[PDB]
């Protein structure tokens, strides 16, 4: 019993982390097969970040300007190329610990584990989510660019995020493993600011189903509602729309607990209109939205990754 | 910037997890060199747990009664010995992925990472603290015994917890890796209950400092307080007594923020007497007490000018 914010096992990702040094800038790299991936702003300084011309700055750089360290071992860069906002550094040796992996671009509301790294050495792992405004509420200090976010999909490591920048409000922005920034952010030190962040509705409902599995039933009511009636109320509380596909994804948790998805929406509407009244749900005094439906099934069923 | 419940990388611990089966019971074991450590209650039947004589029960066991599996490969057991409540199974193969490790016994109020496992395979990694009543609020299902808690100091893994039981209130009890239980619990199916649990005051203060570092300041005040006068209020709200040892530990955090330790106690005092008034601190609507000062400095320390 019990319910906790839980990250994925980081073992297969630790064996892929690498240090990449360029001139006077140092960050982290992802070593998969014979290719190292890292943010492209490693070739620039703090002065260049105000408006960097990445094309002309990479023309000046050569293969010997890229120092890649795999722990206490130096790697030999034999090729380099830029794809959007990341660099692909071809090395002469394949990582022996290379796991079965994919590159995926996640939708807003999806959760993942972040292996925060510094100088190519992992120091921590935590579970966060891609916010609706395409930011993440991570924990990163200076020098953590190149850290990766990932899911474990059955037998495969699903890389979905690489950390790049910190925004003025304290949140973070980054790219997928193809160099494309999530949202309208760029790798330039400017005045870009995140929009208003909303609550991931389908995750709150999955979290409420987790509370029912673990014994909490005080928020259930004898009310009921439709999708439009619920969406119109949650809209004024900055909640994301609940699609008909989201109702289908919550199907398994609705059938296991015997509570209709629309009945659970009626419960959430009361909590939005009346609050928690100082009460707690699964050890939290507010509504948690960083648990996807499958995240609930993994913890409650003890899903293991071999 | 930002603050997250962050666990240590679990790669060095995953490579030590194995599956131990005796009779109809299956749980997890720790594979270090040529020894497998696991809870000794794996050798008991349901009738034995009522009043077990572990000395008498282990002598009756043969080596082939234990089936140890590293992945899908059987580990040949060649001997068994008992140290307190931990069974030590000698195997014929030394674990080639054994990391630098030590066995440590933590104090109440400290934190560690838990690698929750089932059938020798990891399910997830999360953080928790040793409650003042010598329990942990984990997320454990049937089959999770043998999962270990741990910290990492650079390259060395300090094992500090092995899971054994769940108490009637839903919290969990276990031992260090030498087999000594935390608290007055025993590995016998008898009537047991967790003591009165208090809030770890020094951890809440460390968490309030983390909020100051990240920009939150609404809870501060001009007031000050002494050690005695604060402990008068802390005792009234089921908080652990703050001591000079705790004050000295919060030293670096007090200097980094310029807020004296006793000044932050006057802010925590006001929060306990008035509540949070509906506002949040670092994403929580209640006071968090499972972040040690070390955990805060680990995520929030920059550079100290002297």
């Amino acid at each position: 019993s019990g319910f906790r914010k839980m990250a994925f096992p980081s073992g297969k990702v630790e064996g892929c982390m690498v240090q990449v040094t360029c001139g006077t800038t140092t960050l982290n790299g992802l070593w998969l097969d014979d290719v190292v991936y890292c943010p492209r702003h490693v070739i620039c300084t703090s002065e260049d970040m105000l408006n960097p011309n990445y094309e002309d700055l990479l023309i000046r750089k050569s293969n010997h300007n890229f120092l890649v360290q795999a722990g206490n071992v130096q790697l030999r860069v034999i090729g380099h190329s830029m794809q959007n906002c990341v660099l692909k550094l071809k090395v002469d040796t394949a990582n022996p610990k290379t796991p079965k992996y994919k590159f995926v671009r996640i939708q807003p509301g999806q959760t993942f584990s972040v292996l925060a790294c510094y100088n190519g050495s992992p120091s921590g792992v935590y579970q966060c989510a891609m916010r609706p405004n395409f930011t993440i509420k991570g924990s990163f200090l200076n020098g953590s660019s190149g850290s990766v976010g990932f899911n474990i999909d059955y037998d495969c490591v699903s890389f979905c995020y690489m950390h790049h920048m910190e925004l003025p409000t304290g949140v973070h922005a980054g790219t997928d493993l193809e160099g494309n920034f999530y949202g309208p952010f760029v790798d330039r030190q400017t005045a870009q600011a995140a929009g208003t962040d909303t609550t991931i509705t389908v995750n709150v409902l999955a979290w409420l189903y987790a509370a029912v599995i673990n014994g909490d039933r005080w928020f259930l009511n004898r009310f009921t509602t439709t999708l439009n009636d619920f969406n119109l109320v949650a809209m004024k509380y900055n909640y994301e729309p609940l699609t008909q596909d989201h109702v289908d994804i919550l199907g398994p948790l609705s059938a296991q607990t015997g509570i209709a998805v629309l009945d659970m929406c009626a419960s959430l509407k009361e909590l939005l209109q009346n609050g928690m009244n100082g009460r707690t749900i699964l050890g939290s005094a507010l509504l948690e939205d960083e648990f996807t439906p499958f995240d609930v099934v993994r913890q409650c069923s003890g899903v293991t990754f071999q």
Side-chain angles (χ1 to χ4, degrees), chain A residues 102-106 151 158-161 176-178 182:
Chain A
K102 304 165 313 176
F103 288 170
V104 313
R105 186 171 182 90
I106 52 178
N151 289 91
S158 180
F159 294 107
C160 59
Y161 177 81
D176 52 7
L177 270 300
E178 284 164 81
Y182 284 96

Side-chain angles (χ1 to χ4, degrees), chain A residues 155-170:
Chain A
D155 69 329
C156 182
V157 170
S158 180
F159 294 107
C160 59
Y161 177 81
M162 166 165 283
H163 180 57
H164 275 70
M165 296 288 176
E166 164 170 309
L167 294 184
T169 65

Side-chain angles (χ1 to χ4, degrees), chain A:
Chain A
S1 68
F3 199 75
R4 281 271 192 173
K5 208 90 185 299
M6 195 172 303
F8 288 95
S10 60
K12 302 179 181 178
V13 178
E14 294 164 44
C16 301
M17 297 315 299
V18 111
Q19 186 187 256
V20 176
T21 301
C22 194
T24 59
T25 309
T26 294
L27 40 66
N28 303 279
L30 183 62
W31 189 14
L32 294 173
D33 291 349
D34 53 339
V35 180
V36 178
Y37 309 89
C38 77
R40 69 169 175 180
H41 69 80
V42 69
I43 70 180
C44 316
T45 79
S46 304
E47 181 192 16
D48 307 2
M49 280 288 93
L50 288 84
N51 191 9
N53 192 336
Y54 288 100
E55 293 290 344
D56 298 334
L57 298 197
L58 185 57
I59 293 175
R60 262 51 189 82
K61 286 317 185 75
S62 182
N63 271 338
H64 67 289
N65 308 135
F66 292 126
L67 310 183
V68 178
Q69 301 189 21
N72 59 322
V73 171
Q74 175 197 354
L75 294 190
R76 266 222 144 275
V77 175
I78 67 178
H80 59 274
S81 58
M82 189 206 305
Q83 180 179 350
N84 297 122
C85 293
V86 297
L87 295 182
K88 299 166 71 175
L89 301 171
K90 170 106 167 302
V91 298
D92 70 325
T93 169
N95 180 22
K97 304 181 181 183
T98 299
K100 182 185 184 303
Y101 70 96
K102 304 165 313 176
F103 288 170
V104 313
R105 186 171 182 90
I106 52 178
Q107 302 278 49
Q110 186 60 223
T111 59
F112 54 98
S113 295
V114 164
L115 183 60
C117 298
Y118 298 91
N119 305 279
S121 170
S123 66
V125 52
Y126 56 95
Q127 190 75 1
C128 62
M130 177 64 62
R131 304 304 308 181
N133 59 6
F134 299 101
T135 61
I136 76 172
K137 305 275 280 297
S139 183
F140 296 114
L141 298 181
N142 192 76
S144 58
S145 294
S147 305
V148 297
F150 67 99
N151 289 91
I152 300 185
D153 203 359
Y154 187 64
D155 69 329
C156 182
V157 170
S158 180
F159 294 107
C160 59
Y161 177 81
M162 166 165 283
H163 180 57
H164 275 70
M165 296 288 176
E166 164 170 309
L167 294 184
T169 65
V171 299
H172 306 92
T175 69
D176 52 7
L177 270 300
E178 284 164 81
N180 295 284
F181 263 95
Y182 284 96
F185 305 115
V186 287
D187 50 356
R188 173 183 172 180
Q189 194 169 126
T190 178
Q192 49 188 343
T196 299
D197 190 17
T198 58
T199 305
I200 312 157
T201 299
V202 68
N203 287 7
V204 177
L205 292 176
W207 178 74
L208 288 173
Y209 279 113
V212 178
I213 291 182
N214 286 267
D216 265 324
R217 273 180 167 262
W218 70 269
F219 46 88
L220 310 178
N221 54 45
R222 210 126 268 254
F223 295 148
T224 183
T225 183
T226 65
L227 284 82
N228 297 329
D229 197 8
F230 167 81
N231 283 314
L232 287 165
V233 181
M235 171 187 315
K236 293 182 176 180
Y237 293 95
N238 277 322
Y239 270 60
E240 281 300 279
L242 191 72
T243 64
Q244 180 57 243
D245 286 350
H246 287 168
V247 181
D248 299 357
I249 301 179
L250 295 168
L253 290 173
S254 179
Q256 198 219 151
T257 61
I259 304 178
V261 178
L262 283 312
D263 265 18
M264 188 67 75
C265 291
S267 307
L268 177 54
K269 185 193 302 178
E270 262 297 320
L271 294 179
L272 294 180
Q273 291 174 305
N274 286 15
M276 310 282 291
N277 310 134
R279 300 158 185 158
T280 60
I281 293 177
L282 286 176
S284 179
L286 39 74
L287 301 178
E288 305 292 338
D289 72 328
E290 300 207 342
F291 287 109
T292 66
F294 188 64
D295 283 334
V296 183
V297 173
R298 286 197 301 100
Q299 183 170 176
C300 296
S301 300
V303 170
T304 58
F305 311 103
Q306 310 163 6

